[PDB]
Amino acid sequence: MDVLYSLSKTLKDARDKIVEGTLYSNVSDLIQQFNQMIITMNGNEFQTGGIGNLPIRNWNFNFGLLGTTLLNLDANYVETARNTIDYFVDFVDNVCMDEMVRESQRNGIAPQSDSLRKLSAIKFKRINFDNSSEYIENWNLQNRRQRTGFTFHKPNIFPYSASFTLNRSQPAHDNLMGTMWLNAGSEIQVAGFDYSCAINAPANIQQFEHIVPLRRVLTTATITLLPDAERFSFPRVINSADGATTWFFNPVILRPNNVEVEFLLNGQIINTYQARFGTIVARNFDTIRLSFQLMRPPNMTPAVAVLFPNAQPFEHHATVGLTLRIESAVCESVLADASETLLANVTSVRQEYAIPVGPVFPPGMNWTDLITNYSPSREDNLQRVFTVASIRSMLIK
Amino acid sequence: MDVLYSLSKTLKDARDKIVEGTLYSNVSDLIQQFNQMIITMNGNEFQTGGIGNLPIRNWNFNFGLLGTTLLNLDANYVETARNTIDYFVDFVDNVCMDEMVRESQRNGIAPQSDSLRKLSAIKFKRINFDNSSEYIENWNLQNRRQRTGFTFHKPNIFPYSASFTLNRSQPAHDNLMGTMWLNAGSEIQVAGFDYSCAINAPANIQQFEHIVPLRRVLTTATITLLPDAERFSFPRVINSADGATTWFFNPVILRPNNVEVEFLLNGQIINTYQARFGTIVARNFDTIRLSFQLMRPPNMTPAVAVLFPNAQPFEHHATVGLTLRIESAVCESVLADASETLLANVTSVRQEYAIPVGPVFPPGMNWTDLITNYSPSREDNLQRVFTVASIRSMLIK
Amino acid sequence: MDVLYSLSKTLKDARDKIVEGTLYSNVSDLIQQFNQMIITMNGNEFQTGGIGNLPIRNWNFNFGLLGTTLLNLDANYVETARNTIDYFVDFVDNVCMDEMVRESQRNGIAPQSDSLRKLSAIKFKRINFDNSSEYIENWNLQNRRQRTGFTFHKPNIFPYSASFTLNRSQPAHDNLMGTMWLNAGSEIQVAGFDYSCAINAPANIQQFEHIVPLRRVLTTATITLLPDAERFSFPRVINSADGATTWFFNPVILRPNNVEVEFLLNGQIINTYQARFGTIVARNFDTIRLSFQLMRPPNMTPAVAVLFPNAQPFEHHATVGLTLRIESAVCESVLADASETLLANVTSVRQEYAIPVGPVFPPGMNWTDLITNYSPSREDNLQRVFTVASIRSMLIK
Amino acid sequence: FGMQRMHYRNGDPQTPFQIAEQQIQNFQVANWLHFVNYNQFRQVVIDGV
Ligand SMILES: [Zn+2]
């Protein structure tokens, strides 16, 4: 695993530094690495593929060393090295696709393919080169039990969920109370409603609350908070809880009163913010607890006072909502986000070669089903496959 | 072109590695490159500028080599090298602005300025250094006909478009049917409507469809799909097709029934997703085909049943919409996106020096007009200018 | 300051390049740097912490050099170097937290902690290594008075603001005119309204305008402009100016007529765009001036003509809005954005160790209060603390 | 080429041809100096020997 990154690092540098006309002292230490790759790899033989429609290929290495005697590199020296690099870079593609496609349930952090088990001998350890990427540095710190961290831009921490809750209801569905929400990606939009507009509430104030637990602990997040749910603002018809009938929701929107956002960790309040919108921070949390309340306005112009009567026909329903959005955070387990394409490389290999459903991952690599039940057996497999997908992205985009 | 990147790479490293007090073995291989720049460049003379308000400057190189005899670098050695770097870094600015401003129609991939044509001799090829950036690596892989790829965050693949289509209409404009859409940046919001709410449709179901063709083929995209068009949710008045009269649109919103999203490539279905919202992938596609339908609810409470009568006056119009958004994808041609500023550097040079409209690019470098007719003659010019803008961004931000 | 970055650069490279089994020529120049760190640092003694709940620790350096005689590194050579790196990387954490927590008002660009004042002697200058990061390169260019630049993705340039303005009002609040806006993060949503729908305006056209001044000058921005404010599109009730009464706002939405966006610099028009939506550029500006107008439609179908009478009861109010959004720009002072987490590292240290409110920064490091009054005394402190937070992020995530 | 003397230390890690190929600017002289520097044998087992 450490020597699979070390093969790809000095094939990336060999296509970049060994160019025509360059001075020899620029590449004097790469060629000592590239010659010492070849000496270790000669005489061995490998075999990749076999699962699904992934074809079986056999690999055999018998190459010669590079020359170490020029002052400026010429077109003979480049063209005799390109037909050696192009055989190794085809070998690393078929080892990385052989490993992203396999999985185990007992110990997923171990190598699973036949070729990567064979590269983990002490014979092949002399190919080891620097480990400077983000995923190979966190592969080594976490293997010694030291603290790691991945930096994300808009991480997919919330599974998709769109539902509601009725705290007061009747079969006519004309005097209701409760909340509605959408949790999707890295964004929460909750909105509380009350059809009577707190005409009989004590002190004309109705209290709402919405609690979102996370799956993993986030660290040093940057969060944007805005006092409107724009998705629950228009008239719509909504089905019932069991799909029997439908009910109508015609909102008018007040401002949210007495907003309190809390950031919990094992039930302890780490941060809190009271009527403070814009950008906020959250240093360590795993549970977000939103709290906001509706207050009936005590003074109303004649255009407003017609909307909220005392009797039963309520044609304009009051609505109070919020909107939260995580911009960037630092987690310790691997996730998906909006910047890098490591999830897209894993699913595209499995979909292309028609791979059967195994014992660990959901069918079709569904991210909503995978972050919902994000077991420690799935975490060790998901890190092992995102790290191999990161090695393949250096050579083959 | 390859030696213009090689001038900027070792002037960036010369301001970073040649600092006061550093050990000599840290910079022992950079000085052999920097001295070998100077030997090649002496005795030559250059000329940049001349088009628009870009002034004409003459360049002449007569410099001395750097010393290779200290153990730790002192303030004499730094200050005698800064007054050599500051002349080269002024030369590279005026060659990069001379090339981003010119264009050709026959073969745009060739150098156009007078200075960059002169740097493409075999005399200047010994200045060549490593080619490790993203745009200079894809400049070399594509020059040998090998497969390339650029990674984008929210790529500007859709030209701006906001229009509608009426599948059923009359001059009164009170019983309509069709779709509305906004395609802008990397986001599609389509919404279908029906004023009668399928009271006379067969099985009370109305079918909608919206097909978006792309300009270039995208690969391994990460796409977010949400079941509401929030832009077509409020009451508005819309002009007619020929601008004669105006018509009114008062929506209420049902949920989209039987959603199918397809990802086509040469008419072949690569991927498909049926009633699956959240994050999805798309491994290879060039045409997105959205399909969704409106179904009249069979059971309605008395608050809902007043909205949809059988007769002609329809005061509340039914609406069903979707929302699609591309987070990150990998294309093969150059584009614009939301992370890097290579389009902004090209237009800012042309606007500053009052450059006349040439034969290839649209007036004012309008991106909506450039991605609409994205010919292969414009693709070769746009890659040649984004690559020069990437070289200038290393030295001068 | 320059030698604090140089300690962290060669401890990051020492954990990456000194691995088991690697060839000695790969690390032959790092060990000459790492041995020359140790010779300078021996015999000295330091002291960090003391403010808030940050504990006091004493540091003392007495270490031995590394061996320079192997051909391939073995597990003795790695394990004898890891127990030297782990003492230095604990020292740099407690110097970086000692400096992010302190501040001054006279000259904030000078070092404030006791340890960083002691590292600024000429004895410690031989530890200096390359300065290749973005923040340490802009630390050195700006220290000699040369032009710098930071590249941001969605920069937090606007303080949070949500308010309105009534150009025509009466205590009944039934015939109003004015604008509403939200300025938050990097997004402007302005919307102008008129209850009479220009029935008595000259030529039935009502003119609106909204001017947003910036705090710092932005350069080469990429801006998305869309012709709808989706936040001011639904019915809501709004309080009065002094919080006395509430007033009702029921919108219908026309399209914006005759849109002009201007980009000012010292009162001079740099760029202008007239009825051009989508993506636009802005090369140099510090003031955005939006201008748009409402026009009554001259031809109306019978469904539209009922909405806008001639008399006083106006139940459907006209609304015209815009939406602007900065995707990426280049500033010269430090800011916050949506990609990097340098603001989150500073506040998380101050919140964890219970640090009292000092003379410069707002209580709780409130970014809305800090960009509102962004004095040159706060700019020198904010750059000095974001640069230290960038050094700590290399070693400890 | 008008250069000074070598001023060579006994016990230099580099031979006098190795600190000469980085000082001389002539292409035809210095790439012969580079051939003499990095000239060695090649160990190949021919017939078991
Ligand atoms: Zn982004």
Side-chain angles (χ1 to χ4, degrees), chain D residues 6 9 15 18 24 37:
Chain D
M6 182 71 88
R9 285 90 172 83
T15 62
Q18 288 177 0
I24 297 166
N37 288 316

Side-chain angles (χ1 to χ4, degrees), chain A residues 230-279:
Chain A
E230 300 175 357
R231 189 180 176 89
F232 303 107
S233 300
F234 46 82
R236 74 175 75 194
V237 293
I238 304 169
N239 53 2
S240 65
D242 53 355
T245 60
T246 64
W247 56 275
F248 178 65
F249 174 69
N250 189 3
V252 298
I253 285 177
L254 283 77
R255 63 177 177 86
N257 193 3
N258 197 1
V259 179
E260 293 178 354
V261 175
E262 294 178 354
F263 286 141
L264 298 172
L265 178 60
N266 292 320
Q268 297 294 321
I269 299 170
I270 297 298
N271 296 113
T272 182
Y273 295 101
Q274 296 178 357
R276 178 176 171 180
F277 299 106
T279 175

Side-chain angles (χ1 to χ4, degrees), chain C residues 61-74:
Chain C
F61 297 100
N62 194 1
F63 292 102
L65 287 310
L66 292 181
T68 59
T69 186
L70 278 78
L71 194 146
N72 291 113
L73 302 186
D74 55 357

Side-chain angles (χ1 to χ4, degrees), chain A residues 153-154, chain B residues 153-154, chain C residues 153:
Chain A
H153 170 67
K154 292 169 69 176
Chain B
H153 171 67
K154 292 169 69 176
Chain C
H153 171 67

